[PDB]
Symmetry: C6
Subunit: 30 residues, 6 copies
Amino acid sequence: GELKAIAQELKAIAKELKAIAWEDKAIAQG
Amino acid sequence: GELKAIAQELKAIAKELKAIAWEDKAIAQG
Amino acid sequence: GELKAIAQELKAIAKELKAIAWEDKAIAQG
Amino acid sequence: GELKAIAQELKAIAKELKAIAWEDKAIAQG
Amino acid sequence: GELKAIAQELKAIAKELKAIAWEDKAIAQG
Amino acid sequence: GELKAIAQELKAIAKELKAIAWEDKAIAQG
Ligand SMILES: [Cl-]
Ligand code: NA
Ligand code: NA
Ligand code: NA
Ligand code: NA
């Protein structure tokens, strides 16, 4: 169903934001 | 249910964005 | 209900994006 | 209704991301 | 309807994230 | 239907965030 697909896509979004957070941490640390 | 799953994923997203804000703060500082 | 919880989480997301915008503004200024 | 509230919060979110893009452009110019 | 309004606001958010990716590219370039 | 349109726009958002992560990675490297 589409609500589950939406939940799954939000999970993917959370994962990409976690990647952004880590890269921004690396910029900050530098 | 999937509506709760969606709300929980949005909660995770809010938490990652708080992390990003914290790292960007550190970028501004350095 | 869960729709209200989703609207709430979106509000928290908007709040964090405002913090990000203010930090990116600080990076730009410096 | 909460669906309208959700649409409104997504509108606020789009507005914040436009503000972020503006500052990131200024960072790029610097 | 509000579901279409939500889909249209998500399309606006994607467009803004595109702009952010483009400016981050410009930052990485310089 | 609009729930599929929403899921599709969330997919486009995840794709743009993957692009931001990659550009921020490039900034971190630089
Ligand atoms: Cl930077
Ligand atoms: Na992280
Ligand atoms: Na200014
Ligand atoms: Na560019
Ligand atoms: Na990396």
